[PDB]
């Protein structure tokens with residue numbers, strides 16, 4: 245029970261990074277997908293790309309985390325993890341190739357949406373299998389995955405900012421995104437392959453030798469994490485990206501305000517929140533404070549909705565100064581990452597070892613369910629207003 249050189253922990257960190265960095269990079273290239281559609285089309289495809297991507301992403305993600313939650317035992321973990329990684333690698337490679345070939349708007353749209361469905365279908369399997377596997381190890385090792393995911397968001401924000409500041413065409417920035425993701429997926433595979441020869445890994449993984457009952461034991465953390473991401477995705481990014489500066493001195497702020505004050509703030513403090521859990525896990529797996537703080541986050545809905553959103557037609561700006569928005573985004577993002585990591589770490593520990601794997605898989609589904617519910621609410625809000 246001694247992780248020498250913290251090798252297994254570092255590999256779990258890299259697994260987390262490898263799970264989300266590609267997808268995150270994909271999301272950050274939305275400007276490339278919509279702009280490409282605009283320069284190609286001669287109700288529009290770019291006007292619907294975001295919403296159709298949300299559907300092509302959240303439906304497969306939710307379906308396959310569900311199926312994995314009750315079918316993971318039938319497929320070896322090495323197959324589920326390494327096959328999902330190789331599939332995603334192949335998809336992102338193709339995504340990079342399409343940047344350099346000429347294609348009409350509608351085929352590009354359709355093919356990109358197909359690739360999005362695959363990314364999130366194999367992603368679901370890969371994410372559900374990783375949290376299941378981490379369910380056999382101490383809680384710190386689920387925090388490793390969460391922390392590595394947080395780093396994936398931070399890197400995505402650095403990449404977005406650097407891309408704007410470079411002055412390069414959106415297509416070549418996006419080609420860099422996709423090639424980077426391919427390299428990261430290859431590094432993730434290598435790291436995963438190094439686990440079986442580590443004694444610490446075999447110690448907890450040798451523990452392999454009633455879904456309704458398991459769900460009853462983790463229901464508090466499962467619904468908590470679902471509510472975490474319902475709130476988060478209900479406000480971020482679709483709603484928060486519409487905030488405008490009120491103290492800008494220069495027109496140069498315009499193209500940077502959102503990627504800095506919204507995306508960077510979020511991914512910095514969400515990453516840090518997830519990272520703190522590997523060393524500090526208050527309030528504890530049995531404390532009723534964790535669901536209570538998850539509930540209290542509901543305050544951010546009015547708070548952020550009453551920030552300086554422009555154009556606005558129905559609500560008033562109660563918090564106009566950027567400092568309000570950045571402060572709310574930091575707290576909004578820190579509570580998300582910190583409480584989400586706690587729920588994912590503790591969930592598997594509410595159950596016996598021979599069920600921790602399944603518990604982790606279920607926790608993954610509820611996380612994704614949160615995401616899907618968030619996407620719905622934001623849409624329903626925008627569809628009514």
Ligand SMILES: [C]OC1=[C]C(C(=O)O[C][C][C]N2[C][C][C]N([C][C][C]OC(=O)C3=[C]C(O[C])=C(O[C])C(O[C]C4=[C][C]=C(N([O])=O)[C]=[C]4)=[C]3)[C][C]2)=[C]C(O[C])=C1O[C]
Pocket residue numbers: 262263264266267268271272273274294297298301305332363364366367368370371393396397398400401404477480481507511611612615619
């Ligand atoms: C939010 O975000 C973001 C974004 C950005 C941008 O650009 O916008 C654009 C995009 C748009 N959209 C699209 C999509 C949709 N939606 C909703 C949702 C959001 O959410 C998300 O998706 C998530 C989550 C999360 O958790 C964090 C997750 O996990 C749990 C997820 O799953 C998936 C996967 C997994 C795995 C994989 N494998 O493994 O492979 C793959 C894949 C997801 C919305 C919309 C930017 C940024 O920065 C840079 C950010 O941040 C990072």
